[PDB]
Amino acid sequence: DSSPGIWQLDCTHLEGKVILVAVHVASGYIEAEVIPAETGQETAYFLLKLAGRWPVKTIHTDNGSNFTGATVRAACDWAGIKQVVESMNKELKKIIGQVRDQAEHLKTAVQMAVFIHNKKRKGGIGGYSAGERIVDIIATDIQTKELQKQITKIQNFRVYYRDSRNSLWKGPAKLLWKGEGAVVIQDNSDIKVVPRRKAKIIRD
Amino acid sequence: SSPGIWQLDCTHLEGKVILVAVHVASGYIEAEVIPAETGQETAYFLLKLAGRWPVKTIHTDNGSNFTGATVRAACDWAGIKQEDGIPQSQGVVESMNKELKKIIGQVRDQAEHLKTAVQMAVFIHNKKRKGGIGGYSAGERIVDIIATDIQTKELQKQITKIQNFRVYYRDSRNSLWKGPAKLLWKGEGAVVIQDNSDIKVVPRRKAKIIRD
Numbered sequence A: 001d002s003s004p005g006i007w008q009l010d011c012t013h014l015e016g017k018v019i020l021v022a023v024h025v026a027s028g029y030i031e032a033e034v035i036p037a038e039t040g041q042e043t044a045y046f047l048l049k050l051a052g053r054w055p056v057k058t059i060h061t062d063n064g065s066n067f068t069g070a071t072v073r074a075a076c077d078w079a080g081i082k083q084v085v086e087s088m089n090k091e092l093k094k095i096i097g098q099v100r101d102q103a104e105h106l107k108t109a110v111q112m113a114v115f116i117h118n119k120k121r122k123g124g125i126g127g128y129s130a131g132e133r134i135v136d137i138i139a140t141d142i143q144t145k146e147l148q149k150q151i152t153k154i155q156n157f158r159v160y161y162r163d164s165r166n167s168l169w170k171g172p173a174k175l176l177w178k179g180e181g182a183v184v185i186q187d188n189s190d191i192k193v194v195p196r197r198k199a200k201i202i203r204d
Numbered sequence B: 001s002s003p004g005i006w007q008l009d010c011t012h013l014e015g016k017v018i019l020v021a022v023h024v025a026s027g028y029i030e031a032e033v034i035p036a037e038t039g040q041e042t043a044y045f046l047l048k049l050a051g052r053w054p055v056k057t058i059h060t061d062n063g064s065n066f067t068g069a070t071v072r073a074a075c076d077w078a079g080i081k082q083e084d085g086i087p088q089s090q091g092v093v094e095s096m097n098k099e100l101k102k103i104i105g106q107v108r109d110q111a112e113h114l115k116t117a118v119q120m121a122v123f124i125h126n127k128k129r130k131g132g133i134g135g136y137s138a139g140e141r142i143v144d145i146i147a148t149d150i151q152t153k154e155l156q157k158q159i160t161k162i163q164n165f166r167v168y169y170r171d172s173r174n175s176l177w178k179g180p181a182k183l184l185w186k187g188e189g190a191v192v193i194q195d196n197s198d199i200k201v202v203p204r205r206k207a208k209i210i211r212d
């Protein structure tokens, strides 16, 4: 659905062979390989590795049998992988050939071409390289989730509160912050600040 | 550079061998079932490791495999370095080999091959956290470690460079020489220095920057 870890897997052909291609959208970072059988199993293995290395929460597919098949679905279920790559594919070849005369198999040409596109910076004015943007982007996503869990954990404590010794206790609202003699709670759509005395907390 | 150190080791399980790359700093493993234990697969597995991640230094376990010639012939293509051999750093990668094994054995009856179980272990170890709400995982620690660097080095390099220049000053309206402060900025009319917990802006006539 919608999760930062979005990738676009696709099959490209060359050398009477097929290269499974993975591309991290937000990043621009790639990671390809030459898969023997373009079956729904070779693609799936390709995910098991990737998913164990980078955080892959969701992927896209170009209908291909080796994609929509339930052969993949198995892994995607195991790893929790809910289920412009075009522009990159060409770029992949743009480099695979130039190096062709420096390696053995095509596979090596394929990887060397990757290594060249990832480290490949964006000029020189503060521009990073896909290998860097991906790491940055994910590093911040980890930090964002961190604060999220941090907030939901604190929400776990519920509060009842009131006003005068003549008012009524309301709630259970969710605790937001606690300090300086007061409690800050979110009653629903309101962020309220109540005196510690006019409040009662309980672990849910 | 701890953010570029990788230890590579080959282990054998119920049949053949497998390559196991470990990012020392985070614990981030990355094993692959290589057919033979030759420096032909090694140089390759290392070629892919370096394209996806930033590899600077390698720490092999001196087995013919990683000592090959067409192995070190690849590192130069990239930018890998290598260092001397050997209870604190040792098991960092071996206490991983059996850690990978202990895991492979729990998903073996679930995988239809060895690789599938090995990866499943790579995946499991890397996503495995260190608690409930707090402790990080190896897959995370590695992005954090690699990311803080990308956005810290070419800015920490400057500070260090300029602070390697010591300075002596005497605060205006007084003639006792304080120093050595560390230099932060040099202008034609004044200097900015960090003494200890102070950042002082000193005129040029009251400072003496030291050559090296």
Ligand SMILES: C[C@@H](CCC(=O)NCCC[N+](C)(C)CCCS(=O)(=O)[O-])[C@H]1CC[C@@H]2[C@H]3[C@H](O)C[C@@H]4C[C@H](O)CC[C@]4(C)[C@@H]3C[C@H](O)[C@@]21C
Pocket: A150, A151, A154, A157, A175, A176, A177, A178, A179, A184, A201, A202, A203
């Ligand atoms: C996610 C939280 C962090 C809250 C936190 O962690 N607070 C202490 C909880 C301690 N405990 C749960 C352990 C108590 C359990 C007691 S029990 O008896 O229930 O066991 C953040 C994000 C939104 C909040 C800030 C507001 O937007 C802005 C506001 C401006 C002020 O000028 C000072 C900061 C203040 C009050 C905010 C406080 C705090 O930064 C909040 C709730």
